[PDB]
Amino acid sequence: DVNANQDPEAIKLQKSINFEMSKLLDDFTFKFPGTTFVGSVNNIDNVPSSFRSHMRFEILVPVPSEAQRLRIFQWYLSS
Amino acid sequence: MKASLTFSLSGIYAPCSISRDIYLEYGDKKAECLYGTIRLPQYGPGCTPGKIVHCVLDDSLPFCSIVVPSKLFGFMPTQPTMDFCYFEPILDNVVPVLDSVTFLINEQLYSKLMDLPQEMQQIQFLHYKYNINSMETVVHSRDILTSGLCQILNCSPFPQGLVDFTETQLILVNDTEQKLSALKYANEDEEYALPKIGTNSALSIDLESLPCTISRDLLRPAPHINDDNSIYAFTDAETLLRLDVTSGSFITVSNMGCVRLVKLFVLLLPNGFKKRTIYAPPKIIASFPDCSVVTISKSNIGHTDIPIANQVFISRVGGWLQSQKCFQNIILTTLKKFFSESKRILCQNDLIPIAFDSSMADLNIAEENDESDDEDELGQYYKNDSLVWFFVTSAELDCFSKDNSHFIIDPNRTKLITTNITNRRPLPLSRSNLQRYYGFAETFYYDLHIFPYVRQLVNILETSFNCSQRGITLNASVLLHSTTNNVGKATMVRFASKYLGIHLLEIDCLSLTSNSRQLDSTSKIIGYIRAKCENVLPYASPAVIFLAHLDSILLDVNANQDPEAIKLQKSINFEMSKLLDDFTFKFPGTTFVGSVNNIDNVPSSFRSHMRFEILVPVPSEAQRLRIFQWYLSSHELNRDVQQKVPVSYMDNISFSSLSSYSAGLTPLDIKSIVETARMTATARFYQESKKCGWLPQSILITQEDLSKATSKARNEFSVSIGAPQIPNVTWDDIGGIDFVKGEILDTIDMPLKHPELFTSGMKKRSGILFYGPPGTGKTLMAKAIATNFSLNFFSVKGPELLNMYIGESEANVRRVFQKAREAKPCVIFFDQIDSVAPKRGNQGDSGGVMDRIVSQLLAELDGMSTDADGVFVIGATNRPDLLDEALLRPGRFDKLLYLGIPDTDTKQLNILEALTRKFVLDNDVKLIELAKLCPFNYTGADFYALCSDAMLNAMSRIARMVEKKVSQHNELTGENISTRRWFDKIATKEDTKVVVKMEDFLKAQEQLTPSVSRAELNHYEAVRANFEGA
Amino acid sequence: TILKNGAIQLLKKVILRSTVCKMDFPKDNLFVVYISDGAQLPSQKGYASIVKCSLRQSKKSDSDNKSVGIPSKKIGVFIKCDSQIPENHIALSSHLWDAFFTHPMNGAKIKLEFLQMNQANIISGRNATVNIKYFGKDVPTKSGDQYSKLLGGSLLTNNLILPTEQIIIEIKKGESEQQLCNLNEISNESVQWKVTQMGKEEVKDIIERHLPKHYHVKETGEVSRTSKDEDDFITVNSIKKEMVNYLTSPIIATPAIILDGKQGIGKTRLLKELINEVEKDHHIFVKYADCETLHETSNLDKTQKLIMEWCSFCYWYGPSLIVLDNVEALFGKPQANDGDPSNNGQWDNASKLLNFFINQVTKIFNKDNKRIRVLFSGKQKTQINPLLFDKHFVSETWSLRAPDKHARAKLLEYFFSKNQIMKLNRDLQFSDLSLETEGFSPLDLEIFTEKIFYDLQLERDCDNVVTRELFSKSLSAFTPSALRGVKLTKETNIKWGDIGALANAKDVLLETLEW
Ligand SMILES: Nc1ncnc2c1ncn2[C@@H]1O[C@H](COP(=O)(O)OP(=O)(O)OP(=O)(O)O)[C@@H](O)[C@H]1O
Ligand SMILES: Nc1ncnc2c1ncn2[C@@H]1O[C@H](COP(=O)(O)OP(=O)(O)OP(=O)(O)O)[C@@H](O)[C@H]1O
Ligand SMILES: Nc1ncnc2c1ncn2[C@@H]1O[C@H](COP(=O)(O)OP(=O)(O)OP(=O)(O)O)[C@@H](O)[C@H]1O
Ligand SMILES: [Mg+2]
Ligand SMILES: [Mg+2]
Ligand SMILES: [Mg+2]
């Protein structure tokens, strides 16, 4: 994300990649059919707006519930 | 269309004979009286605005020729007249009729007019006197009906048009001051066949620069294909007669051992140049340190000039441009182009001027071609922006060595050969305006009699110029500094340079490296400076090195810095200091003319050497007048646009009021205003042309437009300082606050309107604060002042100032006051002063910063050395007792205005009406009982809540009604739409217009509480008693 | 002057400027050029060429020797009169551009020459012959008669390349003037054609000429390129009208215009359509920058060369325009401060470029008003460097406010159409469909439409585009760009109802929150 307490040169060179990543996503999406960009993050709030908005689908992956951890157990104890 | 021209001594309104061909093929056959328009082409930067005329058929005129009265332009056809004009017969014969025309008349004719008995009889007398007819005769402006008798003072609707002599008002003005005696129809100042008898040898006469370029089409004679415009000279006809030859072949000009060959043509009649003087272009004038008077002689042998053009020697004159790497190529190409002409003549010691385009330095248009490669028409797109000279020394003599005075250069025999760089002085501005001649971006022509500061600079530079023959190293550095940007420092420097004729070096902040200067930036800077200078100084005498924006390069030591970073700063400082003095004694006459936008930050090690520091104030009232007079001038607006219709201002403008109304604006702002005015005028012109109405032949700036363009410029400035967009409250909403209203008027506006009685340094009591119970107008009054008074309005958002750290609050306060002080007519609105200025030194408080900040307030707000008191301060609080006394004093806050509850039915009705003003009230019932039924404990804000509640109820009624209507419609149909869809499919505007009936008021008034209890109100009453009761 | 052929004569040279106003005519002609109405045409036919643009050639022409110097090529042209095109401009139809191997840019100098001649007008004066030889990778052999029908049916001159189909026109009949020859005035019985393939050695020799391959970027053809992801624009707002009316005015106040906006609210597409419009009916040359793509901005000396090059080109061409998307990257004040000398805060590394650009532009604007103008755009007006407002560069301003109710209908209609498969049922309508979409903008709308397409395609178990009662559900899952970045909450699930005696308050709430 944009840094409010950092030297201007660092901020500018970071903005450079921030923009170019959007441009790269655009050009790859254009170039071939089927190309599916599936990124992952560990805290949505940190992603810049220039990328937070342009992205289509956001999926919240929760800590597994009761119904699920049972299956996970049944898996990891399988022969 | 181009028509042959000749003149006659007929009357001003006499019909203008036109040839049969034009009258038939273009003249309208249905018109009873045909009207056309004529343009006179004259020696200037543009064609004259068209003048309209009435024309009639005449078979005696040859092909495409016209005849007009010379008295229409204030002269007689005694001298050679012009031979053609541009003409167009008006399509549909459209002409406008002026409602009023203002005439100036002599005393005798005015006495005759009173003596004439009756109005209609006087009208007929004027009809006979000056051939003025109703709906038939067309009038113009700035014209003279007869020499020294009457003149057209003004014409309001249009510069020219028909007169409804039956009804058009004629504003006759007696010439009480005898100004009409100054009128003069190009008459001779007497004439003698032989003022001196047998003076064939020579004649002595003045030389002055030809004010503008010359176009071949305007020339009476028919010179050959080439080698004409370089040696032209123009004069009056009689001067030719004194030389015994009319437009003779060649003339010679000789003084101080310098003899040159020149060609003399006749100056064409309509131009208004001076008398008995030589007018020549810069090419010839540059050769001389010319005396105001100069002698000329016949030279018949010039017709027998000799082409000895072999191995000519050329030299680049010293100059700023000549030493630039990139320009050199285009300079070479344009010089070769100039010498490509077949028959140019030349003689030793001649300066040959060479113009070229500054921005084409990189546009190599094409390589040389075997055939069909030429520049003539290709160049028309671009016009030159820079000028240099070339100094010529010697040439071959060959078998024709018997004479070498004047010779031709032939491309078939001449080759390009050059020597090293020579040197020579420029041309002082006082003698020849080169920019004017070549249409360059003219440097502003200061007038030393008016502008103080420029005189100091020019005097210093001219002193250093004159000390050349004294021969001592007295040259001194000069530093310009200003309180604000865009005050024309570089312009005034260029003015001085051109005036004294001093070559100017313009180094600037287009440097190479300024960030991370550790990367050998010191070298990249100083080596660049030394290289740039060393290629010019040895060839300029005197010389000027001008360093624009020197402030941003010679930065001073920072309070907080890296211990080693500052070392580079020190190094650059010192080396700059060294190179400062090095040029002083390495060359004679060198002057260091630096510029800075704030002298406080210049390094003392560098500044201490400085011995002259001129502050350049923002132009006061007197100067702005001149600045306007300049930028509005013909030679400024008409330039650089190339619009097919010339431009000008309407004479009804007024410098004196305009200047006073544009206070505080810098020159750049002025030019912005002028440009915007030009835009709006052009838009008006093309809008009218789009319309079916009469089309003026010129576009006229109008003061009625400047009056609002200046306002827009001021709003732009107000946005610059970042002021908020306060809502558009009006001075009329304030209601029952008449006392406070007048109190405010007596201070905010009274010393601002008719600014003469208060025009003094007095303590004009710029302090005022409102105090009292909540919700009685304190913020609204401020909001009104913010836009109804045109004073810049600064908002102090409560405890905005307070800040994280120890000292940044003390920086914020000072920054606020500094920025406000930048724009003198400004206001400071301390909203809820409580949060910022609590009572100093109370026991029930901690941290102490609230004491420091209030102390700083007490300091900066009043302090000492205060001046330009226009900075008002308006404060507000719910309760003042928490303020410190030291604020409750004159000079800071003199009168505390208690905007109390109105307690008065007059005031109550006033506020109720002011609140209800702008929305419709049904008049079937009278509102006064609303005042009578409320107890006086109700408050200005709660009457607002009363009104809004009543409105909301009455409009909820309309909401229910429309709900019923939409439900009914849904029942009628298949219930296929909601209310939202109903509002886009269907509309019942008149039904939605809610009108409140006072029954709603009588409902609402039962439900709303007072905004304060008796407990609080008694408190504020006691507060007032303490502060006001005394 | 009489041409090398004694039956042909030269009249006069003239220079004009190109335009792309799309003057059209049937296939019979390839070299028609449209002069403007005015001074009568001294001749019906003529010759033409273009004065090639070039750099200063500094550093030995940028380390490229350019040893193969060529004086371009001379062409012959029909000339016809038109009333629409302005006086000083020349219209150059679609053909004869590829001959010059230059893209049909708006503005470029044409050398035009009027030709006179007596004898060769006579029909079937002599037999004509020419070879249409394949130059590069070529279509298989085809009859010469249909080539003549397609190529130079009325007029032509030898040495003409054509990259449109990789061919060369040649003839060496002998004792021939190697100059202009008319074809449509000659009967078919007095003309001959033939076709062959050009030798590889000669092909590579000719390739040494200045022949910039226009389709080096892959394309399906001269009429179709995949880049056109979006090929329409919707007149949602007046601003496009405003700028067209003001920018093209005969006289302007200040060189610059500033176009502010909001995240994805329209700027780039609006400017791209303003280009696509202004380039056509007003004969304005445009240079597009997109400063983001520009590298090494802070290298002041290097960037300054591009800064100069921009304005140099723009001045050499006719009335032009400069447009920068996302300016603040190239001329933006950092605005972040903790401690700094006031002068360096005024003048940091970035602003130097701004001052240079301003000075350089004003140098022209002050001596040719209509020549060069600039049009910035950036996230926010005030955010931009204060020099612009101080030096009085920008005079008038505009803001793309979020589109109003009445406007959104068109946008949604167009985006729905764009996918060409989504459509509403008879029972559903656009104008109501939009009203729920408050606070949106075109980015929001386009991603929302894609979201609807996905949710209808799989998640409804239907093939056809069922398109009601899922709209609200999908919207519920959506977050507009603006909201997307800040701390809003919708966590509370408690329904609109569940009221108690709180009616006496719920009324008020309705009367102050919803009404
Ligand atoms: N007093 C003035 N009279 C006329 N024109 C002026 C004046 N001051 C500035 N100008 C105009 O400003 C331009 C050159 O002066 P300019 O404002 O750049 O001065 P400067 O001293 O270099 O300013 P700064 O250092 O504040 O940028 C020209 O367009 C000139 O017409
Ligand atoms: N006498 C009045 N004339 C005009 N408007 C009034 C008057 N009294 C109240 N109002 C209206 O009611 C509100 C009162 O504004 P006011 O200027 O008193 O606010 P304030 O200074 O923030 O008040 P407070 O004393 O609560 O801090 C405004 O919306 C104003 O329009
Ligand atoms: N009025 C419109 N008509 C047609 N399509 C539009 C319109 N507005 C937006 N679009 C489409 O939606 C897209 C939204 O991106 P847009 O061009 O508005 O953003 P941008 O200016 O590039 O953004 P940023 O401000 O982040 O640099 C456009 O590229 C275009 O495809
Ligand atoms: Mg300056
Ligand atoms: Mg208040
Ligand atoms: Mg964009």
Work out whether strand C45-50 and strand C109-117 pair parallel, antiparallel, or are unpaired. Answer: antiparallel
Rounded Cα distance between B356 and B350, Å, is 19
Rounded Cα distance between C204 and C190, Å, is 34
Helix crossing, C349-365 with C300-316: angle to 10°?
Answer: 20
Nearest to B421 by CA among B538, B311, B544: B538
Work out whether strand C320-324 and strand C285-288 pair parallel, antiparallel, or are unpaired. Answer: parallel
Neighbours of B130 (CB within 10 A): 17
What tokens appear for B1017 in the block? 């109100």
Nearest to B149 by CA among B183, B176, B100: B183
Rounded Cα distance between B73 and B268, Å, is 14
Neighbours of B533 (CB within 10 A): 21
Residue with the two structure tokens 């003392």: B604
Rounded Cα distance between B338 and B312, Å, is 14
Work out whether strand B84-89 and strand B2-8 pair parallel, antiparallel, or are unpaired. Answer: antiparallel
What tokens appear for B107 in the block? 């005393």
**Closest chain A residue by Cα to residue C294:** A16
Task: Write the residue in C71, C300, C309 that is nearest to B367 by C-beta.
Answer: C71
Indicate the annotated binding residues of B for ATP: 772-779
In chain C, count H helices and then E strands.
17, 17
Indicate the burial class of C334 (C-beta count within 10 angstroms; 0-12, 13-18, 19 or more).
Answer: middle
What tokens appear for A40 in the block? 């992952």
Interface test with B, best of C299, C368, C389, C515 (most B CBs within 10 A): C368
Interchain contact, A11 vs C334, CB within 8 Å: yes
What tokens appear for C9 in the block? 């004569």
Nearest to C52 by CA among C37, C29, C72: C72
Which amino acid appears at position C38 of this protein? G
Q: Please state how this structure was obtained.
A: cryo-EM
Question: Cα of B388 to ligand 2 centre, how many Å?
Answer: 70
How far are the Cα atoms of B385, B637, B673, B979, C363 from residue B440, in angstroms, in the given order?
6, 13, 22, 68, 11
User: DSSP character for C224?
Assistant: B
Interchain contact, C366 vs B676, CB within 8 Å: no
- Max CA pair span of chain A: 58
| B737: CB partners within 8 A, 6+ apart | B777, B781, B899
Interface test with B, best of C247, C251, C511 (most B CBs within 10 A): C251
* Measured torsion, CA atoms of residues C268, C269, C271, C274, in degrees rounded to the nearest 10: 180
What tokens appear for B812 in the block? 């914020």
Residue with the two structure tokens 């002021």: B723
Sign of CA dihedral C266, C267, C272, C276: positive
| C161: CB partners within 8 A, 6+ apart | C98, C99, C101, C135, C167, C168, C169, C211
Locate the ligand 2 atom nearest the alpha carbon of residue B772 and give its number.
25
Rounded Cα distance between B434 and B516, Å, is 44
Rounded Cα distance between C392 and C299, Å, is 26
Interchain contact, C481 vs A4, CB within 8 Å: no
Nearest to C182 by CA among C125, C233, C241, C109: C125
Rounded Cα distance between C284 and C246, Å, is 13
- Rounded to a whole number of angstroms, the distance from the CA of C345 to the nearest CA of chain B is 10
Nearest to B554 by CA among B504, B611, B609: B609
Indicate the burial class of B600 (C-beta count within 10 angstroms; 0-12, 13-18, 19 or more).
Answer: exposed
Backbone dihedral angles phi then psi of residue B537, each to the nearest 5 degrees: -50, -45
Rounded Cα distance between B172 and B175, Å, is 10
Chains in contact with C, where contact means 3 or more Cβ–Cβ distances below 8 Å, are A, B
How far are the Cα atoms of B982, C411, C423, C468, C469 from residue C427, in angstroms, in the given order?
16, 20, 12, 9, 12
Rounded Cα distance between B772 and B877, Å, is 7
Sign of CA dihedral C191, C194, C200, C204: positive
How far are the Cα atoms of B329, B365, B390 from residue B325, in angstroms, in the given order?
8, 19, 17
Angle at A29 between CA A23 and CA A32, to 5 degrees: 130
* 3-state SS class at B77: coil
Rounded Cα distance between B210 and C81, Å, is 43
Question: Cα of B548 to ligand 4 centre, how many Å?
Answer: 6
- Rounded to a whole number of angstroms, the distance from the CA of A42 to the nearest CA of chain C is 16
Beta-bridged to residue B594, according to DSSP, are B479, B547
Backbone dihedral angles phi then psi of residue C450, each to the nearest 5 degrees: -60, -40
Interface residue C391 vs chain B (CB under 8 A): yes
Long-range Cβ pairs for the range C92-97 (8 Å, 24+)? C92/C18, C92/C19, C92/C20, C92/C33, C93/C23, C93/C24, C93/C25, C93/C32, C93/C33, C93/C34, C95/C30, C95/C31, C96/C30, C96/C31, C96/C33
Nearest to B697 by CA among B160, B174, B256: B160
Backbone dihedral angles phi then psi of residue B386, each to the nearest 5 degrees: -135, 160
Rounded Cα distance between B967 and B456, Å, is 86
Indicate the burial class of B416 (C-beta count within 10 angstroms; 0-12, 13-18, 19 or more).
Answer: exposed
Rounded Cα distance between B892 and A44, Å, is 53
Task: Write the residue in C297, C450, C484 that is nearest to A52 by C-beta.
Answer: C484
Rounded Cα distance between C472 and C453, Å, is 14
How far are the Cα atoms of B955, C48, C71, C74, C172 from residue C176, in angstroms, in the given order?
93, 21, 22, 17, 7
Interchain contact, A54 vs C229, CB within 8 Å: no
Nearest to B90 by CA among B15, B181, B1: B1
Half-sphere exposure of B850 (CA within 13 A, CB side): 19
| C375: CB partners within 8 A, 6+ apart | C243, C247, C256, C257, C258, C259, C271, C321, C322, C323, C324
Chains in contact with B, where contact means 3 or more Cβ–Cβ distances below 8 Å, are C
Question: How many residues in chain A?
Answer: 79
* 3-state SS class at B905: helix
Long-range Cβ pairs for the range C506-509 (8 Å, 24+)? none
Following DSSP, what letter does each residue of B399-461 receive, concatenated? GGTT--SSEE--TTT----B-S--------TTT--HHHHHT--PPP---TTT-HHHHHHHHHH
In sequence order, what E strands does C262-349 have? 285-288, 320-324
In sequence order, what E strands does B551-596 have? 590-596
Stated as kind and residue range, the H or E segment containing C309 is: helix C300-316
Angle at B706 between CA B703 and CA B710, to 5 degrees: 150
Asked whether the beta carbons of C363 and B359 are under 8 A apart, the reply is yes
Stated as kind and residue range, the H or E segment containing C445 is: helix C442-454
Contacts of C292 in chain A (CB under 8 A): 19, 23
Rounded Cα distance between B791 and B559, Å, is 37
- Rounded to a whole number of angstroms, the distance from the CA of C276 to the nearest CA of chain A is 22
What tokens appear for B577 in the block? 């200091």
Work out whether strand B251-255 and strand B258-266 pair parallel, antiparallel, or are unpaired. Answer: antiparallel
User: DSSP character for B539?
Assistant: G
Which residue from B435, B482, B491, B551 has its CB within 8 A of the most atoms of ligand 1, so it is best to mutate? B491
Which amino acid appears at position C344 of this protein? N
Backbone dihedral angles phi then psi of residue B417, each to the nearest 5 degrees: -135, 140
Interface test with C, best of B367, B377, B381, B678 (most C CBs within 10 A): B381
Locate the ligand 3 atom nearest the alpha carbon of residue C269 and give its number.
17
In chain B, count H helices and then E strands.
28, 36
Rounded Cα distance between B865 and B867, Å, is 6
Locate the ligand 1 atom nearest the alpha carbon of residue B487 and give its number.
8
Helix crossing, B521-534 with B565-586: angle to 10°?
Answer: 10
Distance of alpha carbon B784 from the chain centroid? 32
Backbone dihedral angles phi then psi of residue B961, each to the nearest 5 degrees: -60, -45
Question: How many residues in chain C?
Answer: 515
Rounded Cα distance between B1024 and B445, Å, is 62
| B451: CB partners within 8 A, 6+ apart | B623
Backbone dihedral angles phi then psi of residue B646, each to the nearest 5 degrees: -55, 165
What tokens appear for C102 in the block? 């230059």
Interface residue C13 vs chain B (CB under 8 A): yes
Task: Write the residue in C326, C348, C481 that is nearest to A53 by C-beta.
Answer: C481
Neighbours of C263 (CB within 10 A): 18
Contacts of C515 in chain B (CB under 8 A): 956, 959
Following DSSP, what letter does each residue of B21-76 receive, concatenated? HHHHHTS-TT-SSEEEEEE---SSSSPPPPEEEEEEE-TTS-TTEEEEEGGGGT--
Interchain contact, C304 vs B956, CB within 8 Å: no
Task: Write the residue in C292, C484, C485 that is nearest to A19 by C-beta.
Answer: C292
**Closest chain C residue by Cα to residue B977:** C432
Say whether the peptide bond before residue B542 is cis (omega within 30 degrees of 0).
yes
Rounded Cα distance between C278 and C262, Å, is 24
Could you tell me the resolution of this structure in angstroms?
4.1
How far are the Cα atoms of B237, C238, C436 from residue C243, in angstroms, in the given order?
55, 9, 31
Q: Is the CB of B491 under 6 A from ligand 1?
A: yes
Asked whether the beta carbons of B393 and B315 are under 8 A apart, the reply is yes
Question: How many residues in chain B?
Answer: 1030
Q: How far apart are the first and last CA of chain B?
A: 88
Task: Write the residue in B329, B366, B551 that is nearest to C52 by C-beta.
Answer: B366
Asked whether the beta carbons of B828 and B796 are under 8 A apart, the reply is yes
Rounded Cα distance between B706 and C46, Å, is 52
Backbone dihedral angles phi then psi of residue C379, each to the nearest 5 degrees: -55, -35
Asked whether the beta carbons of B430 and B458 are under 8 A apart, the reply is no
Indicate the burial class of C335 (C-beta count within 10 angstroms; 0-12, 13-18, 19 or more).
Answer: exposed
Question: Cα of B778 to ligand 2 centre, how many Å?
Answer: 6
Interchain contact, C250 vs B669, CB within 8 Å: no
Neighbours of B6 (CB within 10 A): 17
Beta-bridged to residue C50, according to DSSP, are C110
| C142: CB partners within 8 A, 6+ apart | C195
Nearest to C344 by CA among B515, B664, B463: B515
Nearest to C192 by CA among C203, C202, C180, C181: C181
